[PDB]
Amino acid sequence: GFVFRDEFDGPAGSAPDGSKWVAAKFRERIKNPVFWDRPENMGEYRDSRTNIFLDGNSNLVIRATKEGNKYFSGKLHGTFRGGMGHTFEARIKFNCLTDGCWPAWWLLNDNPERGGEIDMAEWYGNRDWPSGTTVHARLDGTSFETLPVPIDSNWHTWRCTWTEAGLYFWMDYHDGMEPYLTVDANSLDDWPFNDPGYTLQPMLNLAVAGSGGGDPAGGSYPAEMLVDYVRVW
Ligand code: NA
């Protein structure tokens, strides 16, 4: 380490580093969905400087906007593939804890047969589900370990350490801090994270609507997610 880093430096309105990040050009199509996952009800993703830009103050801004009756936001899919024996950290400010918003900082292995997902910072604007941290052994969501974690609008560092022994999560780490969650290896059915050559890509998004987002009618838009850095070492 650092094996991967992005400090998000650059002039205001510029785009994130295209060698490091690929912005979603649309919101994923959900199968047989709940109301707020219906395609006409979800908020869309655009690779647009109105929704994903650098502020010129060394933050990535992911901003939800309302344009007429439709909502738009951003999702960054990182190119870096990191493996077992790495720590992943993002410093983030959730200026978007409002109705409809569904921001997240997470890690993804997209393998259809053995994929997995580590959501270390997730907040639900649907006014129902508690914010928290989730390890997903299966992408279908049927084999997981979760821990609700209060999430406010202050700056926080969110950390995951991935070792052969499992997954460790810290909020605002310091030397001597005990992890607030430790998910042991093989503690989940179909646990994939100890497989040969398993890699995880860093992900950032502010979704609007969808199941976790809910109805954005009551929310204050525009709404912003700030990312000072993402680092892997
Ligand atoms: Na920065």
- C-alpha distances in angstroms, 147 versus 19, 123, 139? 33, 12, 18
Q: Is 85 exposed, middle or buried (0-12, 13-18, 19+ CB in 10 A)?
A: exposed
* CATH architecture classification, 1-233: Sandwich (2.60)
| Contact predicate 115/199, CB 8 Å | no
Residue 4 alpha carbon to ligand 1 centre in Å: 14
CA–CA gap between residue 214 and residue 224 (Å, rounded): 17
Consecutive H or E run containing 211: helix 210-213
Strand ranges for 83-222 from DSSP E: 86-95, 101-109, 116-122, 132-136, 144-148, 155-163, 166-171, 181-184, 201-208
Phi and psi dihedrals of 37, rounded to 5? -100, 0
- Resolution, angstroms, 1 dp: 1.7
Residue 17 alpha carbon to ligand 1 centre in Å: 13
What region, left, alpha or beta, does residue 79 occupy, with left being phi > 0 and alpha being psi -120 to 50 degrees? alpha
Residue 8 alpha carbon to ligand 1 centre in Å: 5
What region, left, alpha or beta, does residue 176 occupy, with left being phi > 0 and alpha being psi -120 to 50 degrees? left
Residue 11 alpha carbon to ligand 1 centre in Å: 12
- The gap from C-alpha 179 to its chain's centroid, in whole angstroms, comes to 19
Give the type of residue at 101. C
| Contact predicate 86/199, CB 8 Å | no
Give one DSSP letter per residue of 9-49, joined into a string.
Answer: -S-TTBPP-TTTEEE-SSPPPPSS--GGGSTTTSPEE---T
Q: What is the rounded (10 degree) CA torsion for 105, 90, 57, 224? A: 20
54-66 burial, b for 16+ CB within 10 Å, e for fewer?
bbeeebbbbbbbb
What are the structure tokens assigned to 147, written together? Answer: 């821990």
| Contact predicate 62/224, CB 8 Å | yes
Residue 72 alpha carbon to ligand 1 centre in Å: 24
What are the structure tokens assigned to 223, written together? Answer: 């709404």
Do you find a cis peptide bond into 2, omega within 30 degrees of 0? yes
| Contact predicate 165/147, CB 8 Å | no
Residues near ion ligand 1 (CB < 5 Å) are 7-8, 58, 228-229
CA neighbor of 90 nearest in space, from 111, 71, 62? 62
Consecutive H or E run containing 83: none
Q: What is the rounded (10 degree) CA torsion for 15, 160, 135, 199? A: 70
What are the structure tokens assigned to 176, written together? Answer: 């001597």
What are the structure tokens assigned to 233, written together? Answer: 């070492």
